[PDB]
Amino acid sequence: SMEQVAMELRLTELTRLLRSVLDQLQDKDPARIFAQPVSLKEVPDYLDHIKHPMDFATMRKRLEAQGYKNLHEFEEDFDLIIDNCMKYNARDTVFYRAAVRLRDQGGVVLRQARREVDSIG
Numbered sequence: 001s002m003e004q005v006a007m008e009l010r011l012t013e014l015t016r017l018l019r020s021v022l023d024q025l026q027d028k029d030p031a032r033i034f035a036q037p038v039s040l041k042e043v044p045d046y047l048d049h050i051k052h053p054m055d056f057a058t059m060r061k062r063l064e065a066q067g068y069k070n071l072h073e074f075e076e077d078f079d080l081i082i083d084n085c086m087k088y089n090a091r092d093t094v095f096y097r098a099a100v101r102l103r104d105q106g107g108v109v110l111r112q113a114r115r116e117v118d119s120i121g
């Protein structure tokens with residue numbers, strides 16, 4: 001049906017926009033602290049602490065499968081990245097502080113993404 005096609009074209013375009021957002025977020029992490037999953041072989045107790053691990057590579061995989069239906073879903077995953085980090089790592093660490101900085105800088109990116117998504121429909 002043409003209506004199905006139109007809905008698929010919208011999802012594709014959202015996926016495009018969310019790719020640009022993901023690339024911008026990742027540019028705010030030059031150290032690549034959040035680029036890849038935490039090593040379950042190297043913080044061996046990680047999954048006792050954190051029930052829903054998240055990272056940018058995992059988000060890129062979901063995005064390439066057109067797995068985000070709306071901006072809220074994508075934001076949820078970015079917030080997991082941040083929140084998991086702030087729980088596991090103490091306030092005095094480079095890790096906790098890198099999460100705070102990313103949240104602050106990424107909030108700007110996500111605020112404009114919300115205006116574009118709303119505006120474009």
Ligand code: NA
Nearest residue numbers: 086087088089
């Ligand atoms: Na903590």
